[PDB]
A paper describes a structure:
Acid ceramidase (aCDase; ASAH1) is the best studied member of the family and is prominent for its involvement in Farber disease (FD), a genetic disorder in humans. aCDase is ubiquitously expressed and found in the lysosome where it normally regulates sphingolipid metabolism through intralysosomal membrane turnover. Similar to other Ntn-hydrolases, aCDase is synthesized as an inactive proenzyme that requires proteolysis for activation. The α-subunit consists of a globular helical domain formed by five α-helices preceded by a 36-residue linker region, whereas the β-subunit contains two central anti-parallel β-sheets flanked on either side by a total of six α-helices.
Two structures are of the full-length proenzyme before autocleavage, from naked mole rat (nmr, 83% identity to human) and common minke whale (cmw, 85% identity). In the proenzyme structure, the peptide bond between Cys 143 (Ala 143 in the inactivated structures) and residue 142 (methionine in nmr-aCDase and isoleucine in cmw-aCDase) is intact as shown by continuous electron density. Residues 141 and 142 complete the β-strand, which leads into a tight turn preceded by the C-terminal helix-α5 of the putative α-subunit. The presence of an intact junction combined with the orientation of Cys 143 completely sequester it and the scissile peptide bond from the outside environment, confirming that autocleavage must occur intramolecularly. In both inactive structures, only one rotamer satisfies these criteria (Rot1). Interestingly, the conformation of L4-6 in active human-aCDase is essentially the same as in nmr-aCDase.
Residue numbers in the entry: 27 to 395
The structure:
Amino acid sequence: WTEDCRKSTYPPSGPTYRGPVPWYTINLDLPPYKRWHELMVDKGPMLKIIVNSFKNMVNTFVPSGKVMQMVDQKLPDLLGQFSGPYEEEMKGIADVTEIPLGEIISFNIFYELFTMATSIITEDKKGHLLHVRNMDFGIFLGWNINNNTWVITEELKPLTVNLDFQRNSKTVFKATSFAGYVGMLTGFKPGQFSLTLNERFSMNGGYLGLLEWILGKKDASWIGFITRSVLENATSYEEAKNILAKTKLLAPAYFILGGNQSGEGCVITRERKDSLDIYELDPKQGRWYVVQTNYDRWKNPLFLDDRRTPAQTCLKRTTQESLSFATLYDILSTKPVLNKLTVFTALMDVTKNHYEAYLRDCPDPCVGW
Ligand SMILES: *[C@@H]1O[C@H](CO[C@@H]2O[C@@H](C)[C@@H](O)[C@@H](O)[C@@H]2O)[C@@H](O[C@@H]2O[C@H](CO)[C@@H](O[C@@H]3O[C@H](CO[C@H]4O[C@H](CO)[C@@H](O)[C@H](O)[C@@H]4O)[C@@H](O)[C@H](O[C@H]4O[C@H](CO)[C@@H](O)[C@H](O)[C@@H]4O)[C@@H]3O)[C@H](O)[C@H]2NC(C)=O)[C@H](O)[C@H]1NC(C)=O
Ligand SMILES: *[C@@H]1O[C@H](CO)[C@@H](O[C@@H]2O[C@H](CO)[C@@H](O[C@@H]3O[C@H](CO[C@H]4O[C@H](CO)[C@@H](O)[C@H](O[C@H]5O[C@H](CO)[C@@H](O)[C@H](O)[C@@H]5O)[C@@H]4O)[C@@H](O)[C@H](O)[C@@H]3O)[C@H](O)[C@H]2NC(C)=O)[C@H](O)[C@H]1NC(C)=O
Ligand SMILES: *[C@@H]1O[C@H](CO)[C@@H](O[C@@H]2O[C@H](CO)[C@@H](O)[C@H](O)[C@H]2NC(C)=O)[C@H](O)[C@H]1NC(C)=O
Ligand SMILES: [Cl-]
Ligand SMILES: [Cl-]
């Protein structure tokens, strides 16, 4: 079920609003191992539940139990040590929650593969940029007939957190993530740039990237880890763009990157080895937005999953003269851009240092895809 462009959905309320996203300060001055301990006090019980769901469903489809045995006993050794800070951060999470490290690593692997998204950057007539996104998730292990949801997708909602990463008590970047995950998929560096990651599918894909890694070719970056390293350590739109366009990746991806002034917005369509396309704002020629879902801009959607066309229609209807968090939230609340897989909606304003995220629901009748 789809619908006409929504209006009057902001500030959030009603049946598509699950609730607010809590803020946590992550202190980069702490040793990596300790950075997540305070968050785990609050969200550790929920992380234990989501890994329980994954384990139990895998052990249902593979009743020998041998896959989860490999996850728990061998997966860390197959991949080898991660570069810092990620190894120690994940070990800290595993140790405080008493979850096997291989399951934390597996959780961190989920985000290289099973997300869907709608990401939008807009530029108004004053040159002001907004960057918004829906974060969708579907691993499709468990269906709950009693409320028409996917088990793991729903369990991500209480794991969702807004994070203020600080060094010397000063914000470096802000992000929305899931407790237990140490990469980043959504965030901004105030006054500098904003970044969202959308999954991309291809036959030279993440499954092959993992195989190459296991077989000893480790020159590549994990997509959630390069995103985190850019947010944490890059200092400008152009620097971020260069890193994201050129770094070798474990999996294909779309990077949606906004800056801090007119014209600074692009979609970088990535193969593992390089950029297939960089599509940038061109306000002088009437190109005042970019919209990216999970298919290549020059190709047709997957017939049964076209969120790009409705997002673009609602944007064109809104026009460049009525761009704000409120009107962009309206778009991200319109089915199928909002769908049963939508975990959260995030809204970013780099130059005004405004960052919001909201947990979502999509009441029946709603598309599951
Ligand atoms: C659709 O159903 C999902 C599954 O729920 C089951 O099926 C439905 C149909 C009912 O029969 C229900 O009774 C079944 O259990 C449902 O998923 C549930 O979502 C909630 C809300 O996110 C989760 O709540 C979190 O619970 C953990 C503790 O969970 C344990 O204890 C509770 C209380 O006894 C049990 O109900 C659980 O089964 C577990 O045994 C908390 O740690 C966690 O707290 C943290 O997050 C909240 C924010 O939500 C903060 O306020 C806190 O401070 C903490 O930071 C949550 O309270 C629940 O775990 C989850 N269940 C499962 C099994 O995944 C889903 O939301 C439904 N979706 C829709 C659209 O209706
Ligand atoms: C962004 O860039 C920075 C700068 O390159 C990256 O920071 C480095 O990260 C690696 C991996 O985690 C660290 O390497 C470890 O260092 C351990 C020793 O750490 C102590 O001694 C260091 C001197 O050798 C010292 O620099 C370090 O202080 C740093 O960390 C403290 C704890 O967080 C913090 O309070 C300090 O202010 C300072 O930031 C420690 O006191 C060693 O045991 C390990 O084997 C490993 O080698 C580096 O220490 C980090 N360097 C700095 C200057 O922070 C960072 O990871 C990048 N971020 C991303 C996401 O990619
Ligand atoms: C947008 O970002 C750019 C790039 O970081 C900013 O320009 C830099 O500003 C710093 C000061 O923090 C200077 O040290 C650099 O020399 C500047 N670089 C360039 C290429 O000019 C710019 O100030 C930001 N603009 C806004 C409006 O925030
Ligand atoms: Cl699921
Ligand atoms: Cl919730």
